[PDB]
């Protein structure tokens, strides 16, 4: 579909094709995801890649 | 630094060792491949649904 803007889901199809079960949960896994400090420096990372493909 | 290493950081809580650094690995190769489709058509669509 499109590069996954919720770094959580990225994660779980990650996982997913990885064949990867967590030690805790899903939902503990997804909760640590949501770190502020983690999801900005995702949002972050995207914005840099998207700007620097678009410099063609 | 990085956001691999924070993600890092985090699947070191969530998973055994072999499956944090299989689901990283995965994770930047998916990551890589969505950046690789992203036509100019995307990146306009992306504009109009935040502002
Ligand atoms: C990169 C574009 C902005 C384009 C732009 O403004 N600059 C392009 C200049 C092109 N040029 C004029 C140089 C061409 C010259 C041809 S010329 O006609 O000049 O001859 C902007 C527009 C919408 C932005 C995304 C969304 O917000 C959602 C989200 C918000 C997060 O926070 C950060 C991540 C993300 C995905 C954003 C990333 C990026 O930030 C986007 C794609």
Do not use: N
Not at chain 1, 28 to 40: I, N, T, W
Not at chain 2, 25 to 33: C, K, S
């Amino acid at each position: 579909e499109g590069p996954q803007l919720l770094l959580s889901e990225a994660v779980s199809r990650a996982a997913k094709a990885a064949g990867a079960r967590p030690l805790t949960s899903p939902e503990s896994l997804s909760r640590d995801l949501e770190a502020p400090e983690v999801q900005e420096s995702y949002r972050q990372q995207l914005r840099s890649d998207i700007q620097k493909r678009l410099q063609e | 630094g990085s956001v691999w290493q924070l993600i890092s950081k985090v699947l070191a809580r969530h998973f055994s060792a072999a499956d944090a650094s299989r689901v990283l690995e995965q994770l930047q190769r998916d990551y890589e491949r969505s950046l690789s489709r992203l036509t100019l058509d995307d990146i306009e669509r992306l504009a109009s649904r935040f502002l």
